[PDB]
C-alpha cells in the first residue's frame, strides 16, 4: 500500500528544487569522473532534462506498440523507473536508449507481466543481430537499474486510485450524476501530469484526484462539496487548504511543462552520441 510504501518513503520529494539539485549533482559527478579520466562536449543539466523527456516519450511509444499488449501498470512502472534512474544518473554515462528498454524489461518482470526475453526484444524494430545485441545490453544493465532504484521495485500508479475515486463518486456524490463522463479528459490530464515531474512530488491519490477535479472544472462542474462533504475535509479545514494547494501546484506544473523541440533534441542527440563515443 502507498501509505507505507518505499515510493512514499524514498521517492516522493519535497520540491522541484530538490530534484534539480539531484540532477545537477549527477551531471557534475559525471563531469568530474570524465575530467579525472583524461570541453564543451559535456551536456548541461537542462539539455539532459530535454533528452530525458524525449526518451520518456520514446519509452511510452515502445510500451504502446509492445506486443502482447502491455498493461498500463507496466508502462507506469517503467516510466517511474526511468524518472528515478535519471534523477541520480547522467545520460552521458548510461545511454537513455538502453536504459528505457531496461526499465521496460524490469517493469514487465516486476509487475508479473510474463513475456519471454526473445518476445520482448522482438518488439524492437531492428535486425535479429541488433535485437540480440540490445538483449545483451539490457541484461548487462538490468542489475544496474535495480541498484540505482535502491531495490525499490513496486511503483504505485494513479490508475487504481483513479478507479477508486470514480467508484466513490458514483456511490456518495449524486451531485455529479455520471462520473464516467470525466474519465477521458481526466485520463488526458493524467498523461500530461505523467509528462512532468509530479510523480516524484505527489501521491498517486493526489494525482488522480487532481486529474478528476481538473476534468470536472473543464466541464464546468464545481464539486468542492465532494472534498468538503464526502471526504470530511469540512471537519479539518487546514487539511482541505493543503489539499487544494497540492492540486493547484500540480496544475501549475502541468501548465509550465515545456516539451522537447525537434531541432534541440537533434542537436543534443548528436552531442550525446559524441559523449558516448569518448566516454
Amino acid at each position: 500500500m502507498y501509505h507505507n510504501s518505499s515510493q512514499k518513503r524514498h521517492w516522493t520529494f519535497s520540491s522541484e528544487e530538490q530534484l534539480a539539485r539531484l540532477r545537477a549533482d549527477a551531471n557534475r559527478k559525471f563531469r568530474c569522473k570524465a575530467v579525472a579520466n583524461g570541453d564543451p562536449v559535456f551536456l548541461e543539466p537542462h539539455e539532459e532534462m530535454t533528452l530525458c523527456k524525449y526518451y520518456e516519450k520514446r519509452l511510452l511509444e515502445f510500451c504502446s506498440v509492445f506486443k502482447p499488449a502491455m498493461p498500463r501498470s507496466v508502462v507506469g512502472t517503467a516510466c517511474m523507473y526511468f524518472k528515478r534512474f535519471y534523477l541520480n544518473n547522467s545520460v552521458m554515462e548510461y545511454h537513455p536508449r538502453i536504459i528505457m528498454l531496461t526499465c521496460a524489461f524490469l517493469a514487465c518482470k516486476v509487475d508479473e507481466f510474463n513475456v519471454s526475453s526473445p518476445q520482448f526484444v522482438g518488439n524492437l524494430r531492428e535486425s535479429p543481430l541488433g535485437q540480440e545485441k540490445a538483449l545483451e545490453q539490457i541484461l548487462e544493465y538490468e542489475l544496474l537499474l535495480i541498484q540505482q532504484l535502491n531495490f525499490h521495485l513496486i511503483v504505485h500508479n494513479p490508475y487504481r486510485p483513479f478507479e477508486g475515486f470514480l467508484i466513490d463518486l458514483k456511490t456518495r456524490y449524486p451531485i455529479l450524476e455520471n462520473p464516467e463522463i470525466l474519465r477521458k479528459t481526466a485520463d488526458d490530464f493524467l498523461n500530461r501530469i505523467a509528462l512532468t515531474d509530479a510523480y516524484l512530488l505527489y501521491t498517486p491519490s493526489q494525482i488522480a484526484l487532481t486529474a478528476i477535479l481538473s476534468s470536472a472544472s473543464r466541464a464546468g462542474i464545481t464539486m468542492e462539496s465532494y472534498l468538503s462533504e464526502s471526504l470530511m475535509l469540512k471537519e479539518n479545514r487546514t487539511c482541505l487548504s493543503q489539499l487544494l494547494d497540492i492540486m493547484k501546484s500540480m496544475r501549475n506544473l502541468v501548465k509550465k511543462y515545456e516539451p522537447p523541440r525537434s531541432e534541440e533534441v537533434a542537436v543534443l542527440k548528436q552531442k550525446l552520441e559524441r559523449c558516448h563515443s569518448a566516454e
Binding site: 519535497s14 486510485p161 477508486g164 470514480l166 456511490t171 501521491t203 491519490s205 493526489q206 471526504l231
Partner: protein, 65 residues
C-alpha cells in the same frame, strides 16, 4: 497472559475506507463488476476489487513530503 485481539494500527493519511462487509449496503458494489460463478467458487468476490480500489484512492490523499 491471555491473548486479546487488537486491530492493526496502520495510519493511511487519508479518508476513512468503509469496511468490506458494508460495501453491499452502501451501494458501492453496484458500480464494480460482478464476480462470475467460477470467481465466487474460488473465493473471489467483487467486494475485494471494490475495497482495494477505494483503499488505493484514499491512501495518502492528505500526505505531504
Amino acid at each position: 497472559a491471555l491473548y486479546e485481539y487488537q486491530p492493526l494500527q496502520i495510519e493511511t493519511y487519508g479518508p476513512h475506507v468503509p469496511e468490506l462487509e458494508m460495501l453491499g449496503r452502501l451501494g458501492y458494489l453496484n458500480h464494480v463488476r460482478a464476480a462470475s460463478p467460477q470467481d465466487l467458487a474460488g473465493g473471489y468476490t467483487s467486494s475485494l476489487a471494490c475495497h482495494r480500489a477505494l483503499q488505493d484512492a484514499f491512501s495518502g490523499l492528505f500526505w505531504q513530503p
